[PDB]
Paper text:
The eukaryotic reaction centre is a dimer surrounded by tightly bound monomeric light-harvesting complexes (LHCs) and trimeric LHCII complexes.
From the unstacked PSII dimers, approximately 20% were in the C2S configuration (two Cores, one Stable LHCII), which was previously identified by low-resolution cryo-EM.
Numbering used by the authors:
A (entry chain Z): 1 to 61
B (entry chain K): 10 to 46
C (entry chain I): 1 to 35
D (entry chain M): 3 to 33
E (entry chain O): 62 to 299
F (entry chain A): 9 to 344
G (entry chain C): 13 to 461
H (entry chain W): 60 to 103
């Protein structure tokens, strides 16, 4: 139950890095935010889900 | 120390203080990129 | 020596009151500029 | 040294002061 | 201000008020003084507080009298927390003994005319003898400054330069008493104590005292003046 | 319509027609200062000796008690008082008020209020003259230095006796004891301050030499060049292009100030920020942050101590430390 | 962003370009708040990753874990630490909140609306709309009062806070009967800032601390409602300047005052900053040294009331200027120090001789010795002791670090208040860019200066 | 007690006020300055 | 005056004592050519500290 | 050491993130 | 040295705070032309202020 | 005898300061 928490946390770190690199890129791109809606929303949703998953798995590990 | 589940993430924990200094230096980098207009 | 403290308190309060109410006395209207 | 220094100080505070006063009044009386 | 309401008063209500520098003054009982039970006693928390400081200075018509002064120091003149033991006989002949406690206070007074007279107000090693009305004796007076004290030019008794080193030619002859020899010989004072307002129910004694002691002798540069201390005293039996 | 007494008083106070502008900052600046000067002259002339260390060993400090001008100093407050407030009314007699160093606290408090309101008055006259207001911002650096050496260091060390004595030899004593305590020479903030005053002298000489060297010839050699400058003129008096070209081929072309506004801003900003840094260094030393400690840093392979110049500075600090306040320490650790 | 020609502000004054841009102002503010919470979380994680349990926290160079431990998280009696998981939870929560705030600030900064006035009238504002500025100030006052009441609820019903004045050496105490009396609460405010009074630094009990927090929370909530439902009066409108730079200058002066005041708390106060977490203060360490040498020479068979020093003033115990029995030596200047290990030894007349002789405690002696060893004297290389000391001890007090950094920031922000207040007055006046060259005010009045 | 003192050190005196006359002269001076300022209004 | 009257202390005399301390605690490790193996007991030192 | 290697990789990845986003925005259109 | 540092700081502050408008821009550093024969800081105003 | 010389020199210095401040040459502005 600890290894799955470590895997979820490493995935959260990777998703956070992808967000902090691409979100300013998506925003400051010339007409890029209009079409990057789905990928940015998916990244943020996966980030929130991974935060919640690490939080709920901390009680079990 | 950190909890045993979060022990391997200590090296990525140690870098986290310097991020605001990197942020103000990033503002300087961006101003260099806009040719200081 | 209480009289000295009373006198000093009166003088300090007088000068501080002139300062405060002089700056309340519409200080931005003493502007040498326009506006 | 208690009074020779007094005499030296007196001469130092007068002689160039007097000289400066000569030059200043020589200029001030001329318009 | 008795000892009852003083002990029942906390620190934060005494701080900055000067109550910590005044002796406990009894209000109950009588001034019979003879009424107290004769026998063996070992008094505790001996208290002492001056009310006037006077110096022997005048050579004129006053014929070496004691003159009023100004207290250059703050309220650092009282003495508290002293022990000892005093013996009382039936006829009234009593003896007094002071051994340890805060039995000293460095005090500097200002003579009229801008003169500084420091003195160590001590009652230590007091050997009292007499009756209840007035018992007097002698007490040991320390110097004022220790042997490791340094003057403006180094020097001093225990540690020091033993001379004036800033000039390498005049370190002898006239200034023997300043640098060649440091004097730390203790003096002796005379103290007279009067007992009044004795409360035998709680064993608390009070009254006035009269002490004459020398001032600071320093290293012997100037002869010590005589300091007369008048004030109140307080003690508790057993 | 300006007939009422308060309106007339306000117009007189805010009047720019006075010989010296008073203002609402001046209504505090003037009486507090004149109090400080009055008591400072009187104390420097005939101040009785002051027991600075609290050990009943008084220090004369005043001329009538045997001091010259270099050695004369208003002695700091008694160590028994510490950071307590000691006005005349808190003393029973003027004799003990003078014995315990009360004039030092009165001068320090009035001087701090006076310099603060002088800075405020500088802003006020800049406002009433239609000027840009940052002259007071420039003057905030000596005010910071004075506050650090008169109030902030006594606050940090817990006693007004620990402030800078109001004099010259007292100032040197403050600096020497301060070096013993904190090793101020080995501090980056003091190093920037020293670099700032040295560069301020350098830049003052640079700017003055460049402008006086490049004055336009409007007189002869038998009359002073100052007579060539007429006050209130709009024509420039020196060749900015020639001065900039001289500086550029002297030091560096692309690293020179071709704009006088930027040049004068640099002249304004360099010593001011460096004095800010050194005043903050003194204030950080007040909370015992101290300078660089390199005592026994260089060690050989066998572990023997290899002394350095910092170790010689340590020897100087020891020599000052074992001698400062030679009778006021009953214990080894100097934590006070 | 914009450029120099379109705004008149250079790159080194680029934030001035967003003076009038409400959306970019909000983006910069939210990104900055994300930065602040990021430092809080990152420093919490770094400190708990570098935390050693068998050492006190003041020896390990921590400043945030003492802040959390003062509230009573993971600590037991005597100041010892029982768990670091609350600190870890606080750090992780701050990091996640920082991520959220940083995303919001970046979004408003980059692709947020430039001006909120024409599309979001609730969040739109102009600097001269004094009613709207008072509404924003009222909302922030409600937020601040709610935070103060949240601290009050934490100290009342949510585990209490750490009391260093508890018997035995301090413990996590539940606050009961907070002192809500206006006289004693505001006597701190109208107090002198000198020795013996200390203004509000000399608050010595959590009862007064929580009572003042209740008072400030209620006052902030009522003041927020007042600002939301009122407007500035004509006297305030005449006295004040109503520019954004003016409001910034007012805030700058305020936060400079808070910085100096918090520096003074960190250096002197040992109630809101417990010594078990922050180390001894200057006065505390000096008095601990004097008291430790007192009990050492008392154990060595030497009289402590007698046996004066070389100056004849008293080597161990002597008299304060008021008259209380205080520790001898230079520590006389710290005679007003009050700590948990001297108060049981202090009677009505100061330090009682019989109490110092017989009512001694081994825990008091151990704490005094540890505080004597760990005085707030160190170099900026983190070398313990005075400047002469050998490079052998790695310790500088967190109180010293906080005091130095906060006085520095307070002084810079006072100078920033000076700069911004002057520029605000000059900008409202009209001569912030120079002299009009045709309307010089000096030539309009007579000579002789 | 050899001499008379005010003994105002410490104790947390409001504005350092030990006697009610001190607070009353504070109030009186501030009030009369405020009264002069209030009477001399509606100017400029 | 200070030599003939030991109650006369000034900041100048404090500076003189401090400079004596500098010379004494400096010479041994500052001038190796002098070979000053100065003992502890002759080095000037104040009360405790 | 493994801890030192992970610290250096994390530090390099973070310190390169700023230059990465600025270079990517400079070469990918503009608006910076 | 202290007087020279004071002179440098006070001269820079006085010049930069007694400047003429020459503006249509909030940055005064771009309000300067090297090739001109006019003063950019008011010596009269500076003299009156000091 | 030295103290009177010192006090005289300083009061002369303050006199020169007061003189230079209050009785200076007015700027001509011509
Ligand atoms: C009027 C304002 C005057 C300000 C300057 C006067 C000096 C004030 C001072 O002595 O400051 C110190 C006081 C605190 O005083 C101390 O307060 C202490 C309170 O602790 C006491 O209470 C504590 C309770 O835990 C403990 O028990 C502790 O042991 C006990 O001693 C003690 O009373 C000390 O004796 C006492 O000295 O700070 C304070 O009041 C906080 C107020 C902020 C002070 C800001 C200082 C910097 C000021 C200007 C800098 C300007 C910069 C720009 C221009 C240049
Ligand atoms: C929260 C407080 C605050 C806020 C919101 C502002 C806001 C603003 N300031 Mg200001 N200022 C402040 C405090 C503040 N200031 C302080 C404390 C000072 C010091 C006295 C200044 C001095 C100042 C000046 C001189 C100027 C401004 C200017 C401005 C405007 C443009 C800023 C800009 O883009 O420059 C860009 C920012 C930078 C170039 C960064 C500067 C580099 C710093 C100094 C590096 C220091 C970092 C270092 C590691 C910190 C350690 C030091 C110490 C703490 C140990 C802007 C609206 C300008 C203005 O007036 O516009 C109208 C301008 O001229 N400010
Ligand atoms: C506290 C630091 C701070 C903050 C929050 C801001 C914020 C802002 N500045 Mg600014 N600036 C700063 C410091 C700061 N500045 C300093 C120190 C200087 C002096 C060098 C300047 C000089 C300056 C100038 C000259 C200008 C601004 C401008 C702006 C605004 C718009 C910038 C823009 O959109 O262009 C685009 C910027 C970029 C495309 C750079 C991209 C970098 C990205 C955003 C970094 C984000 C990384 C982060 C990890 C992402 C996480 C998000 C999420 C996944 C959590 C904006 C609100 C402009 C303005 O005033 O608006 C009119 C402008 O003209 N600033
Ligand atoms: C930090 C929060 C905050 C801020 C920024 C403001 C800001 C403002 N308030 Mg306000 N207020 C607040 C909190 C705040 N208030 C709270 C918590 C309350 C509830 C008690 C009030 C109740 C209140 C009222 C009733 C009024 C204001 C008013 C005002 C406006 C003018 C005030 C003024 O002239 O300056 C400062 C004022 C002075 C310098 C004169 C007052 C004298 C002092 C400051 C009062 C305290 C005296 C006391 C002895 C000082 C001890 C502390 C000191 C030693 C440090 C101003 C914009 C006025 C207004 O315009 O209405 C909208 C108004 O009438 N406020
Ligand atoms: C500049 C930057 C500011 C930086 C830091 C500011 C620090 C602290 C801010 C103030 C904290 C203290 C507030 C209460 C002050 C107080 O109660 O004083 C009270 C003290 C009382 O002082 C003493 O108090 C003792 C008992 O506590 C005794 O009674 C003594 O007799 C009495 O003298 O008075 C003062 O010392 C100063 C008050 C008057 C100040 C006059 C100058 C005001 C200048 C401008 C005012 C503008 C408006
Ligand atoms: C715009 C408004 C401008 C100015 C307004 C100023 C004052 C407003 C009126 C204040 C009236 C209360 C203060 C005077 C008073 O009666 O209390 C004066 C008392 C003085 O303090 C008390 O006085 C008693 C005798 O009256 C005792 O002797 C003690 O000194 C003490 O308990 O209150 C204070 O502590 C002063 C601070 C009050 C705030
Ligand atoms: C050797 C013996 C002789 C020595 C001579 C020493 C002379 C010292 C005399 C004392 C100096 C006091 C000056 C007071 C002048 C007040 C008149 C005035 O200021 O103009 C009114 C003038 C009146 O308006 P106007 O005439 O229309 O311009 O403006 C004012 O009202 C401002 C008033 C300022 C009040 C502060 C007093 C001056 C403070 C600085 C003095 C510092 C004292 C130390 C002196 C040496 C340094 C200068
Ligand atoms: C130690 C003792 C002193 C403690 C004082 C503490 C209590 C007061 C502290 C907070 C007062 C809030 C000030 C806000 C108004 C200030 C500017 C103003 O004035 O605003 C100006 C405004 C103009 O319209 O007027 C107005 O809004 C009216 C506002 C002022 C109303 C208060 C006046 C009180 C009455 C006192 C006068 C006694 C007068 C005569 C004394 C003569 C003695 C011989
Ligand atoms: C009307 C008015 C005004 C004016 C004012 C003036 C004119 C000023 C001042 C002031 C002053 C003028 C102050 C003062 C003070 C002083 C003092 C406070 C003093 C002192 C002294 C002393 C304290 C001494 C001591 C001593 C010593 C030191 C030693 C020996 C002994 C003896 C005792 C001598 C104005 C315009 C502003 C406006 C408002 C109102
Ligand atoms: C929590 C706590 C507490 C409480 C506190 C409090 C409650 C506080 C407060 C307070 C307050 C309640 C304050 C007040 C204030 C105010 C201020 C600080 C102000 C200001 C400002 C100014 C400086 C002004 C100026 C001016 C003038 C005078 C003139 C005209 C113009 C103007 C207006 C600008 C205690 C300590 C108990 C305990 C611990 C903690
Ligand atoms: C706009 C702009 C800018 C920017 C600004 C800013 C300020 C930004 C930001 C931002 C931010 C403020 C961010 C933050 C963040 C955060 C994050 C991203 C996070 C996270 C998470 C995670 C993933 C974690 C994990 C963990 C845990 C849970 C615990 C253990 C440890 C670890 C680490 C594993 C600049 C200046 C450049 C330029 C100008 C304009
Ligand atoms: C991982 C982990 C965990 C978990 C955690 C969780 C799952 C949670 C969270 C979290 C969160 C989730 C946080 C947050 C953030 C958020 C924020 C930061 C917010 C915000 C908001 C705001 C700021 C608002 C604004 C506004 C608006 C927009 C409307 C109206 C107006 C106002 C202004 C109010 C724990 C620690 C257990 C353990 C360790 C690991
Ligand atoms: O008083 Mn002036 O100097 Ca400040 O450290 Mn502790 O206390 Mn005393 O010795 Mn080092
Ligand atoms: Cl010394
Ligand atoms: Cl000590
Ligand atoms: Fe120039």
């Amino acid at each position: 139950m600890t290894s799955i928490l470590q895997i979820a946390l490493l995935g959260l770190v990777l998703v956070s890095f992808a967000l902090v690199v691409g979100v300013p890129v998506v925003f400051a791109s010339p007409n890029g935010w209009t079409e990057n809606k789905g990928v940015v929303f998916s990244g943020l949703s996966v980030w929130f889900l991974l935060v919640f998953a690490v939080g709920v798995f901390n009680s079990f590990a | 120390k950190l909890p045993e589940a979060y022990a391997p993430f200590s090296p990525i924990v140690d870098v986290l203080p310097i991020i605001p200094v990197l942020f103000i230096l990033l503002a300087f980098v961006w101003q260099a990129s806009v040719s200081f207009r | 020596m209480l009289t000295l403290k009373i006198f000093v308190y009166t003088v300090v309060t007088f000068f501080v009151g002139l300062f405060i109410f002089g700056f309340l006395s519409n200080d931005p209207s003493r502007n040498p500029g326009k506006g | 040294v208690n009074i020779l220094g007094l005499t030296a100080t007196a001469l130092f505070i007068i002689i160039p002061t007097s000289f400066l006063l000569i030059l200043y009044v020589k200029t001030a009386a001329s318009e | 201000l008795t000892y009852d309401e003083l002990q029942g008063l906390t620190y934060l209500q005494v701080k900055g008020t000067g109550i910590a520098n005044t002796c406990p003054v009894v209000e109950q009982g009588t001034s019979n003084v003879r009424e107290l039970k004769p026998g063996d006693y070992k008094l505790e928390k001996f208290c002492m507080e001056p009310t006037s400081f006077t110096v022997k200075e005048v050579v004129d018509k006053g014929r070496e009298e004691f003159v009023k002064t100004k207290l250059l120091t703050r309220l650092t003149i009282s003495q508290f927390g002293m022990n000892g033991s005093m013996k009382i006989n039936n006829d009234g002949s009593v003896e007094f003994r002071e051994d340890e406690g805060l039995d000293y206070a460095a005090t500097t007074v200002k003579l009229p005319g801008g003169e500084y007279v420091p003195f160590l107000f001590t009652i230590k090693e007091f050997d009292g003898k007499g009756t209840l009305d007035s018992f007097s004796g002698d007490f040991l007076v320390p110097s004022y400054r220790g042997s490791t004290f340094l003057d403006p030019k180094g020097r001093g008794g225990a540690t020091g330069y033993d001379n004036a080193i800033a000039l390498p030619a005049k370190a002898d002859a006239d200034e023997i008493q300043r640098l060649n020899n440091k004097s730390y010989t203790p003096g002796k004072g005379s103290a007279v104590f009067s007992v009044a307002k004795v409360d035998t129910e709680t064993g608390e004694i009070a009254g006035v005292f009269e002490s004459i002691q020398p001032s600071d002798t320093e290293m012997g540069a100037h002869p010590a003046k005589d300091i007369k201390i008048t004030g109140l005293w307080y003690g508790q039996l057993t | 319509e300006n007939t009422s007494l308060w309106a007339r008083f306000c117009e007189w106070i805010t009047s720019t027609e006075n010989r010296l502008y008073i203002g609402w900052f001046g209504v505090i600046m003037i009486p507090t200062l004149l109090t400080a000067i009055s008591v400072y002259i009187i104390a420097f002339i005939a101040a009785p000796p002051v027991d600075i260390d609290g050990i009943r060993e008084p220090v004369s400090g005043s001329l009538l008690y045997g001091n010259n001008i270099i050695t004369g100093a208003v002695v700091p407050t008694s160590n028994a008082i510490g950071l307590h407030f000691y006005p005349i009314w808190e003393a029973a007699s003027l004799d003990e008020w003078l014995y315990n160093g009360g004039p030092y606290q009165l001068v320090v408090c009035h001087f701090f209020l006076g310099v603060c309101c002088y800075m405020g008055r500088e802003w006020e006259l800049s406002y009433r003259l239609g000027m840009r207001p940052w002259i007071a911002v420039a003057y905030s650096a000596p005010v910071a230095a004075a506050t650090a050496v008169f109030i902030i260091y006594p606050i940090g060390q817990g006693s007004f006796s620990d402030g800078m004595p109001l004099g010259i030899s007292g100032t040197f004593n403050f600096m020497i004891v301060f070096q013993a305590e904190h090793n101020i020479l080995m501090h980056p903030f003091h190093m920037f301050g020293v670099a700032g005053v040295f560069g301020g002298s350098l830049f003052s000489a640079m700017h003055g030499s460049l402008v006086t060297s490049s004055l336009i010839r409007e007189t002869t050699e038998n009359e002073s060049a100052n007579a060539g400058y007429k006050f209130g003129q709009e024509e420039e008096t020196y060749n900015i292009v020639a001065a900039h070209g001289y500086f550029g081929r002297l030091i560096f072309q692309y690293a020179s100030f071709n704009n006088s506004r930027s040049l004068h801003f640099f002249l304004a900003v360099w010593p001011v920020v460096c004095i800010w840094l050194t005043a903050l260094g003194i204030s950080t030393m007040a909370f015992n942050l101290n300078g660089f400690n390199f005592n026994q840093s260089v060690v050989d392979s066998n572990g023997r101590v290899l002394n350095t110049w910092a170790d010689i500075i340590n020897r100087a600090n020891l020599g000052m430390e074992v001698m400062h306040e030679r009778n006021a320490h009953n214990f080894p650790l100097d934590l006070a | 962003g914009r450029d120099q020609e379109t705004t008149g502000f250079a790159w080194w004054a680029g934030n001035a370009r967003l003076i009038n841009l409400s959306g970019k102002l909000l983006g910069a503010h939210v990104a900055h708040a994300g930065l602040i919470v990021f430092w809080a979380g990152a420093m919490n994680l770094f400190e708990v990753s570098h935390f050693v349990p068998e050492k006190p926290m003041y020896e390990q160079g921590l400043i945030l874990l003492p802040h959390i431990a003062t509230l009573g998280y993971g600590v037991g009696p005597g100041g010892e630490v029982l768990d670091t998981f609350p600190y870890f939870v606080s750090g992780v929560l701050h990091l996640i909140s920082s991520a959220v705030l940083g995303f919001g600030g970046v979004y408003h900064s980059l692709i947020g609306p430039e001006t909120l006035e024409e599309s979001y009238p609730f969040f739109g504002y102009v600097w001269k709309d004094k009613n709207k500025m008072t509404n924003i100030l009222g909302y922030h006052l409600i937020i601040l009062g709610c935070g103060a009441w949240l601290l009050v609820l934490k100290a009342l019903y949510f585990g209490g806070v750490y009391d260093t004045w508890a018997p035995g050496g301090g413990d996590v105490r539940i606050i009961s009967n907070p002192t809500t009396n206006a006289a004693i609460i505001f006597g701190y405010i109208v107090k002198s800032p000198f020795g013996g009074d200390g203004w509000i630094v000399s608050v010595d009990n959590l009862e007064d601390i929580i009572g003042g927090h209740i008072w400030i929370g209620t006052l902030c909530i009522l003041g927020g409602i007042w600002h939301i439902y009122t407007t500035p009066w004509p006297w305030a409108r005449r006295a004040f300047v109503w520019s954004g730079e003016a409001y910034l200058s007012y805030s700058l002066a305020a936060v400079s005052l808070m910085g100096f005041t918090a520096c003074c708390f960190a250096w002197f106060n040992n109630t809101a900053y417990p010594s078990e977490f922050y180390g001894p203060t200057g006065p505390e360490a000096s008095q601990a040294q004097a008291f430790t040498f007192l009990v050492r020479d008392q154990r060595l068979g030497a009289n402590v009331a007698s046996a004066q020093g070389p100056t004849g003033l008293g080597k161990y115990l002597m008299r304060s200027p008021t008259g209380e029995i205080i520790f001898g030596g230079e520590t006389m200047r710290f005679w007003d120090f009050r700590g948990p290990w001297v108060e049981p030894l202090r009677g009505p007349s100061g330090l009682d001789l019989v109490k110092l002789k017989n009512d001694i405690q081994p825990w008091q002696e151990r704490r005094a010795a540890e505080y004597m060893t760990h005085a707030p004297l160190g170099s900026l290389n983190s070398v313990g002791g005075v400047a002469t000391e050998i490079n052998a001890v790695n310790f500088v007090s967190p109180r010293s670090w906080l005091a130095t950094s906060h006085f520095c920031l307070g002084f810079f922000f006072f100078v920033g208040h000076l700069w911004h207040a002057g520029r605000a007055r000059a900008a409202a006046a009209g001569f912030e860019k120079g002299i009009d060259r045709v309307d010089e005010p000096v030539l309009s009045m007579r000579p002789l200066d | 007690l050899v001499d008379d003192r005010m003994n105002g050190d410490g104790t947390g005196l409001p504005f350092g006020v030990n006697d009610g006359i001190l607070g009353w002269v504070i109030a009186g001076t501030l009030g009369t300055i405020w009264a002069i300022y209030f009477v001399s209004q509606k100017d400029l | 005056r200070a030599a003939e009257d030991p109650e006369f202390e000034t900041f100048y005399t404090k500076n003189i004592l401090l400079n004596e301390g500098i010379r004494a605690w400096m010479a041994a490790q500052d001038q190796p050519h002098e070979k000053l193996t100065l003992p502890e007991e002759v080095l000037p030192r104040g009360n405790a500290l | 050491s493994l801890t030192l290697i992970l610290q250096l990789v994390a530090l390099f990845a973070v310190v390169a993130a700023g230059p990465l986003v600025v270079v990517l925005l400079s070469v990918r259109g503009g608006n910076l | 040295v202290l007087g020279a540092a004071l002179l440098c700081a006070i001269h820079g502050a006085t010049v930069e705070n007694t400047l003429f408008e020459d503006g249509d821009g909030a940055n005064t550093f771009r309000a300067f032309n090297p090739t001109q024969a006019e003063e950019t800081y008011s010596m009269v105003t500076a003299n009156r202020f000091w | 005898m030295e103290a009177l010389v010192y006090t005289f020199l300083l009061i002369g210095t303050l006199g020169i300061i007061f003189f230079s401040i209050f009785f200076r040459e007015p700027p001509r502005i011509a």
